[PDB]
Design an enzyme around this catalytic site. Structure first.
Site, PDB file in Angstrom:
ATOM      1  N   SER A 178       5.475   4.541   3.049  1.00 27.87           N
ATOM      2  CA  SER A 178       5.923   5.459   4.078  1.00 27.87           C
ATOM      3  C   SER A 178       5.186   6.775   3.885  1.00 27.87           C
ATOM      4  CB  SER A 178       7.429   5.674   3.957  1.00 27.87           C
ATOM      5  OG  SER A 178       8.115   4.434   4.046  1.00 27.87           O
ATOM      6  N   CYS A 225      16.232   5.654   4.644  1.00 25.13           N
ATOM      7  CA  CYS A 225      15.035   5.068   4.050  1.00 25.13           C
ATOM      8  C   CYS A 225      15.286   4.697   2.590  1.00 25.13           C
ATOM      9  CB  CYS A 225      13.868   6.052   4.151  1.00 25.13           C
ATOM     10  SG  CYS A 225      12.365   5.536   3.295  1.00 25.13           S
ATOM     11  N   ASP A 258      14.155   2.644   7.618  1.00 27.53           N
ATOM     12  CA  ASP A 258      12.844   2.454   7.025  1.00 27.53           C
ATOM     13  C   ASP A 258      13.169   1.975   5.623  1.00 27.53           C
ATOM     14  OD1 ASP A 258      10.169   2.499   6.292  1.00 27.53           O
ATOM     15  OD2 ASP A 258      10.194   4.625   5.745  1.00 27.53           O
ATOM     16  N   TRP A 293      13.232  -1.276   2.567  1.00 27.93           N
ATOM     17  CA  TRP A 293      12.452  -2.370   2.012  1.00 27.93           C
ATOM     18  C   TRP A 293      13.078  -2.785   0.693  1.00 27.93           C
ATOM     19  CZ3 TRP A 293      10.821   2.761   2.153  1.00 27.93           C
ATOM     20  CH2 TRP A 293      10.675   3.392   0.903  1.00 27.93           C
TER      21      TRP A 293
HETATM   22  C1  LIG Z   1       7.626  -0.827   5.201  1.00 33.55           C
HETATM   23  C2  LIG Z   1       7.660  -0.613   3.827  1.00 33.55           C
HETATM   24  C3  LIG Z   1       7.675   0.686   3.330  1.00 33.55           C
HETATM   25  C4  LIG Z   1       7.555   0.914   1.963  1.00 33.55           C
HETATM   26  N1  LIG Z   1       7.482   2.170   1.500  1.00 33.55           N
HETATM   27  C5  LIG Z   1       7.279   2.387   0.194  1.00 33.55           C
HETATM   28  C6  LIG Z   1       7.186   3.688  -0.287  1.00 33.55           C
HETATM   29  O1  LIG Z   1       7.081   4.632   0.495  1.00 33.55           O
HETATM   30  N2  LIG Z   1       7.140   3.922  -1.666  1.00 33.55           N
HETATM   31  C7  LIG Z   1       7.190   2.850  -2.563  1.00 33.55           C
HETATM   32  O2  LIG Z   1       7.217   3.053  -3.775  1.00 33.55           O
HETATM   33  N3  LIG Z   1       7.270   1.541  -2.073  1.00 33.55           N
HETATM   34  C8  LIG Z   1       7.319   1.316  -0.692  1.00 33.55           C
HETATM   35  N4  LIG Z   1       7.226   0.066  -0.220  1.00 33.55           N
HETATM   36  C9  LIG Z   1       7.058  -1.055  -1.175  1.00 33.55           C
HETATM   37  C10 LIG Z   1       5.570  -1.368  -1.347  1.00 33.55           C
HETATM   38  O3  LIG Z   1       5.035  -1.850  -0.112  1.00 33.55           O
HETATM   39  C11 LIG Z   1       5.337  -2.408  -2.446  1.00 33.55           C
HETATM   40  O4  LIG Z   1       6.148  -3.561  -2.208  1.00 33.55           O
HETATM   41  C12 LIG Z   1       5.674  -1.814  -3.816  1.00 33.55           C
HETATM   42  O5  LIG Z   1       4.956  -0.592  -4.005  1.00 33.55           O
HETATM   43  C13 LIG Z   1       5.301  -2.818  -4.911  1.00 33.55           C
HETATM   44  O6  LIG Z   1       3.964  -3.279  -4.690  1.00 33.55           O
HETATM   45  P1  LIG Z   1       3.003  -3.687  -5.915  1.00 33.55           P
HETATM   46  O7  LIG Z   1       1.796  -4.327  -5.347  1.00 33.55           O
HETATM   47  O8  LIG Z   1       2.837  -2.519  -6.809  1.00 33.55           O
HETATM   48  O9  LIG Z   1       3.867  -4.798  -6.697  1.00 33.55           O
HETATM   49  P2  LIG Z   1       3.672  -6.368  -6.396  1.00 33.55           P
HETATM   50  O10 LIG Z   1       2.580  -6.869  -7.260  1.00 33.55           O
HETATM   51  O11 LIG Z   1       3.576  -6.552  -4.931  1.00 33.55           O
HETATM   52  O12 LIG Z   1       5.064  -6.987  -6.914  1.00 33.55           O
HETATM   53  C14 LIG Z   1       6.261  -6.813  -6.152  1.00 33.55           C
HETATM   54  C15 LIG Z   1       7.299  -7.832  -6.625  1.00 33.55           C
HETATM   55  O13 LIG Z   1       7.579  -7.678  -8.023  1.00 33.55           O
HETATM   56  C16 LIG Z   1       8.859  -8.294  -8.243  1.00 33.55           C
HETATM   57  N5  LIG Z   1       9.636  -7.346  -9.073  1.00 33.55           N
HETATM   58  C17 LIG Z   1       9.584  -5.873  -8.997  1.00 33.55           C
HETATM   59  N6  LIG Z   1      10.497  -5.514 -10.101  1.00 33.55           N
HETATM   60  C18 LIG Z   1      10.986  -6.631 -10.635  1.00 33.55           C
HETATM   61  C19 LIG Z   1      11.837  -6.776 -11.648  1.00 33.55           C
HETATM   62  N7  LIG Z   1      12.267  -5.654 -12.217  1.00 33.55           N
HETATM   63  N8  LIG Z   1      12.305  -7.973 -12.027  1.00 33.55           N
HETATM   64  C20 LIG Z   1      11.898  -9.112 -11.327  1.00 33.55           C
HETATM   65  N9  LIG Z   1      11.018  -8.927 -10.256  1.00 33.55           N
HETATM   66  C21 LIG Z   1      10.578  -7.697  -9.944  1.00 33.55           C
HETATM   67  C22 LIG Z   1       9.490  -8.476  -6.868  1.00 33.55           C
HETATM   68  O14 LIG Z   1       9.345  -9.835  -6.430  1.00 33.55           O
HETATM   69  C23 LIG Z   1       8.651  -7.562  -5.994  1.00 33.55           C
HETATM   70  O15 LIG Z   1       8.644  -8.074  -4.653  1.00 33.55           O
HETATM   71  C24 LIG Z   1       7.413  -0.160   1.089  1.00 33.55           C
HETATM   72  C25 LIG Z   1       7.424  -1.458   1.586  1.00 33.55           C
HETATM   73  C26 LIG Z   1       7.549  -1.687   2.951  1.00 33.55           C
HETATM   74  C27 LIG Z   1       7.558  -2.990   3.434  1.00 33.55           C
END
Ligand SMILES: Cc1cc2nc3c(=O)[nH]c(=O)nc-3n(C[C@H](O)[C@H](O)[C@H](O)COP(=O)(O)OP(=O)(O)OC[C@H]3O[C@@H](n4cnc5c(N)ncnc54)[C@H](O)[C@@H]3O)c2cc1C
Ligand SMILES: NC(=O)c1ccc[n+]([C@@H]2O[C@H](COP(=O)([O-])OP(=O)(O)OC[C@H]3O[C@@H](n4cnc5c(N)ncnc54)[C@H](OP(=O)(O)O)[C@@H]3O)[C@@H](O)[C@H]2O)c1
Ligand SMILES: Cc1cc2nc3c(=O)[nH]c(=O)nc-3n(C[C@H](O)[C@H](O)[C@H](O)COP(=O)(O)O)c2cc1C
Length: 611
Positions: free
Chosen positions: A394, A563, A608, A610
Site C-alpha cells: 500500500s 487497513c 485495504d 491482507w
Molecule cells: C493488497 C495488498 C496490500 C499489502 N500491503 C502491504 C503493505 O503495505 N505492507 C506490508 O508489509 N505488506 C503488505 N502486503 C503483503 C505483501 O504483499 C506480501 O505478502 C508480504 O510483504 C510478504 O511477502 P514476501 O515475499 O516478503 O514473503 P513471501 O515469500 O511471499 O511469504 C509469504 C508467506 O509466508 C508464510 N508465513 C509468513 N509468516 C509465517 C509464519 N510466521 N508462520 C508460517 N507461515 C508464515 C505465509 O504463507 C505468507 O503468505 C500487502 C498485500 C496485499 C495483497
C-alpha cells in the site's frame, strides 16, 4: 484494450480439442488449476487447452456445441467481490449479453477465501449466469476456500469432476504416463545479447526503459531511502522510498505499488548443488504444442540460475501435482510412495501433505534435502515450478506531496518453520537488502485501487490501521495536511493506530506526532497492545469514542477506512462498528449489520486488508 485472438472454438476445431478451461487469476493460482484440468483431459481420451478469457471473446461459446462432446470449464478467483482484472471483459459480457447458449456444457471451480463477505462471488456469478443464458451444468460449482486449504478443495472437486464427465459423455480413463509440456534446448554458442537476464517482457526491457510502464513492462525505480521504522529489535519494519521520476507513472494515496523481487541467491545455488546441475547453462523450454501461444514457461532463452532467481517460485510449499510428477525421480521406494500419495483426496497421504509440506512450510529445497533420493533433472523441475509473482504494498505517500516518489511501509518476513528451518520472505528480504548507495533498482508498477480520500475536503475521515495497516494512512494524513496548507477547509481527520509498545514498534512515531501537533490529525488514538497485562486494541478505542464516531458517521457523513490484517483485526473492527450503530441508532444487531454493509456499497467504509 487488448487485441482479441480469433475464435477459440475454431482453434479447438483445428487442433482437435473438445475441452477448454478458462482461468480468472491474478496470483496465478487459477491459472495453474486450469492447466492441470486441461492436461488431465488426455488421461480420459479427450484433449484440452487452458486459456486467458481476456484474450478471447466468450460470445463464441455459442459455437462450442459445434464440437462433439464439447465442454468448457471456468476456474475463477474473486477479488474484493469482483472478477480478476483479466476476467472483467467476460464479466461485463455476461451481464450485457442475451446470447443463447443452448447446447453448451459447463463446470465452474471458484477460488475464494471465506474470510470475505463476498466469498467466491465470481465463481458463483459465472455458474449462475451461464445457466440463465441456457447452458447446462455438467458438474457442481466448486467452492475453493483459501483460508482452509484451496489445494485440497481442488483435489476433491477434480476427483469427482472427471468421473462425472466420463459418465455423461460415455468415455473411459484411457493409465497415466509422465508427459512433458516443454522440450529442453541447450544453447552452446549464443550471443549474450539474446539471453534473458531477469526482465519480464521484451528482451533488455530492464536495461532500455520506455514508457508506459506496467505489469509487463515494470519501471526500475531507484531506492532513494531504506530505513528501519521500529525502535526495538523483536522484528524489522522498514520504510523505503522509490524514485519514479521520468517514469510518467501516475498515482494517488490508496493505490498499490507492485514489485518484482529476486529469490535468495544462496537458496538458488543450493538447489543447483543438490541436483548436481550447472545453473549457468543457457537454455530454452519450448512448448511441444507448436500451436499454443505460450512458447515457454518463462522468458527464454535464459540460464537456470536466472529462471530460479527471477521467474520461478522456489519458496512456497509445492502443490500436489508437482510432487506427484517428481515422484518418478525418487530412487528410494518409500520416498517415491510418499510423494506419489501427496495428491490423495483423503487418508495418510493427504495428512502427510498437509502437515509435512504445507503446515511445516517446506519449500522445494527442503523436500530435496528431507527426501535425499529425490534427484530430478533441473530442466523438468523448472517446467513444474509456479511463476514468481510480484508483491503488492500500500503506497505510503501522497502524490500531492511526493509526485515523483512512491513510499513503502513493510514488515520483513522471517520465521521459524516447523520444517526446522528459518524461512525468509522473498520480496521483503530482497527489499530490506536494497541500499540507497550502480543504483539499487526495484522493478515496479502501480495498480489503481478504489481506496480513496473523500472528494470533499470537508468530509470527516476515520482511519483504522494497526501495525503495517498504517501504510496508506501516512499518504492520507500527508494529503489532508497538504489540503489545509492550500487554504482548503478540512473536516476531522482521526487516526486509530496500534502497535505492541511505544518503544518497540510505534511506526512513524515522530511524523505522526508532528501531524498531530500541527492539527493535520484531529486525534491520534494509539492502542499499545502489550504495555499492560490486558490487550488494548484499536477497536477498544473506537468503542470508547462510540458517541463521537456515531455523530461523525450518522450526522457528519464520515468516511471509514480499515487497513491491515483481514483475518482478525478487520472482522473485530467491523463488529465494533456494528455495536456502535446498534446502540446509537438504535437498532437490532441485524439492522446494524445492514447499515454498515450499506456504507460499504455507498463508498463510505473502505478496506485495504491482507493476510
Ligand atoms: C493488497 C495488498 C496490500 C499489502 N500491503 C502491504 C503493505 O503495505 N505492507 C506490508 O508489509 N505488506 C503488505 N502486503 C503483503 C505483501 O504483499 C506480501 O505478502 C508480504 O510483504 C510478504 O511477502 P514476501 O515475499 O516478503 O514473503 P513471501 O515469500 O511471499 O511469504 C509469504 C508467506 O509466508 C508464510 N508465513 C509468513 N509468516 C509465517 C509464519 N510466521 N508462520 C508460517 N507461515 C508464515 C505465509 O504463507 C505468507 O503468505 C500487502 C498485500 C496485499 C495483497
Ligand atoms: O502484521 P503487522 O506486523 O502489521 O501487525 P502486528 O504487529 O502483528 O499487530 C499490530 C497491532 O495489532 C494488534 N492486534 C492483534 N490482533 C488484533 C486484533 N485481533 N484486533 C485488533 N488489533 C490486533 C497487535 O497486538 P498483539 O500482537 O499484542 O496481539 C498489535 O498491537
Ligand atoms: C486483495 C485480495 C482481495 C481478495 N478478495 C476476495 C474476495 O472478495 N472474495 C473471495 O472469496 N476471495 C477473495 N480473495 C482470495 C482469493 O480469491 C484467493 O486467494 C484466490 O485463490 C486467488 O487466486 P489467483 O492466485 O488465481 O488470483 C482476495 C485475495 C487478495 C489477496
Amino acid at each position: 484494450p487488448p487485441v482479441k485472438e480469433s475464435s477459440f472454438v475454431e482453434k479447438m476445431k483445428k487442433t482437435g480439442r473438445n475441452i477448454i478451461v478458462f482461468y480468472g487469476s491474478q496470483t496465478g493460482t487459477a491459472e495453474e488449476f486450469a492447466n492441470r484440468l486441461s492436461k488431465d483431459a488426455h488421461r480420459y481420451g479427450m484433449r484440452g487447452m487452458s486459456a486467458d478469457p481476456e484474450e478471447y471473446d466468450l460470445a463464441d461459446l455459442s459455437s462450442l456445441p459445434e464440437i462433439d462432446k464439447s465442454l468448457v470449464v471456468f476456474c475463477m478467483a474473486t477479488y474484493n467481490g469482483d472478477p480478476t482484472d483479466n476476467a472483467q471483459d467476460f464479466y461485463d459480457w455476461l451481464q450485457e449479453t442475451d446470447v443463447d447458449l443452448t447446447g453448451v456444457k459447463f463446470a465452474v471451480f471458484g477460488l475464494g477465501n471465506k474470510t470475505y463477505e463476498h466469498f467466491n462471488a465470481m465463481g458463483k456469478y459465472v455458474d449462475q449466469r451461464l445457466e440463465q443464458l441456457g447452458a447446462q451444468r455438467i458438474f457442481e460449482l466448486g467452492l475453493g476456500d483459501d483460508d482452509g486449504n484451496l489445494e485440497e478443495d481442488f483435489i476433491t472437486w477434480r476427483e469427482q469432476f472427471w468421473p462425472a464427465v466420463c459418465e455423461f459423455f460415455g468415455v473411459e480413463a484411457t493409465e497415466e504416463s509422465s508427459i512433458r509440456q516443454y522440450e529442453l534446448v541447450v544453447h552452446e554458442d549464443m550471443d549474450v545479447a539474446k539471453v534473458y537476464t531477469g526482465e519480464m517482457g521484451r528482451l533488455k526491457s530492464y536495461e532500455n526503459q520506455k514508457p508506459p510502464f506496467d505489469a509487463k513492462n515494470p519501471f526500475l525505480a531507484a531506492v532513494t531511502a531504506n530505513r528501519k521504522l521500529n525502535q526495538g529489535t523483536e522484528r524489522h519494519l522498514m520504510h523505503l522510498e522509490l524514485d519514479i521520476s521520468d517514469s510518467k507513472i501516475r498515482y494517488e494515496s490508496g493505490d498499490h505499488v507492485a514489485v518484482y523481487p529476486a529469490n535468495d541467491s544462496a537458496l538458488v545455488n543450493q538447489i543447483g548443488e543438490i541436483l548436481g546441475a550447472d545453473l549457468d547453462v543457457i537454455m530454452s523450454l519450448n512448448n511441444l504444442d507448436e500451436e499454443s501461444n505460450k512458447k515457454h514457461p518463462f522468458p527464454c532463452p535464459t540460464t537456470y540460475r536466472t529462471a530460479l532467481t527471477y521467474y520461478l517460485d522456489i519458496t512456497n510449499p509445492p502443490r500436489t501435482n508437482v510432487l506427484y510428477e517428481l515422484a518418478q525421480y525418487a530412487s528410494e521406494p518409500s520416498e517415491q510412495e510418499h510423494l506419489h500419495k501427496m495428491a490423495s483426496s483423503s487418508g495418510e497421504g493427504k495428512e502427510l501433505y498437509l502437515s509435512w509440506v504445507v503446515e511445516a512450510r517446506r519449500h522445494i529445497l527442503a523436500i530435496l534435502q528431507d527426501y535425499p533420493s529425490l534427484r530430478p533433472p533441473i530442466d523438468h523441475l523448472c517446467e513444474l515450478l509456479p511463476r514468481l509473482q510480484a508483491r503488492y504494498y500500500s503506497i505510503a505517500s501522497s502524490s500531492k506531496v511526493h509526485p515523483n516518489s512512491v513510499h513503502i511501509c513493510a514488515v520483513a518476513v522471517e520465521y521459524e518453520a516447523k520444517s526446522g528451518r528459518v524461512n525468509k520472505g522473498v520480496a521483503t528480504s530482497w527489499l530490506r537488502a536494497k541500499e540507497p548507495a550502480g543504483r539499487a533498482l526495484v522493478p515496479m508498477f502501480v495498480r489503481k485501487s478504489q481506496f480513496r480520500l473523500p472528494f470533499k475536503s470537508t468530509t470527516p475521515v476515520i482511519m483504522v490501521g494497526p501495525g503495517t495497516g498504517i501504510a496508506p494512512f501516512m499518504g492520507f494524513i500527508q494529503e489532508r495536511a497538504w489540503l489545509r496548507e492550500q487554504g482548503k477547509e478540512v473536516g476531522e481527520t482521526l487516526l486509530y493506530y496500534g502497535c505492541r509498545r511505544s518503544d518497540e514498534d510505534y511506526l512513524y512515531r515522530e511524523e505522526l506526532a508532528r501531524f498531530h501537533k500541527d492539527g493535520a490529525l484531529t486525534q491520534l488514538n494509539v492502542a499499545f497492545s502489550r504495555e499492560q497485562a490486558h490487550k488494548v486494541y484499536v477497536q477498544h478505542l473506537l468503542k470508547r469514542d462510540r458517541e463521537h464516531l456515531w455523530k461523525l458517521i450518522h450526522e457528519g457523513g464520515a468516511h471509514i477506512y480499515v487497513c491491515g490484517d483481514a483475518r482478525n483485526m478487520a472482522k473485530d473492527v467491523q463488529n465494533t462498528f456494528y455495536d456502535i450503530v446498534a446502540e446509537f441508532g438504535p437498532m437490532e444487531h441485524t439492522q446494524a449489520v445492514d447499515y454498515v454493509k450499506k456504507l460499504m456499497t455507498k463508498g463510505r467504509y473502505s478496506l485495504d486488508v491482507w493476510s
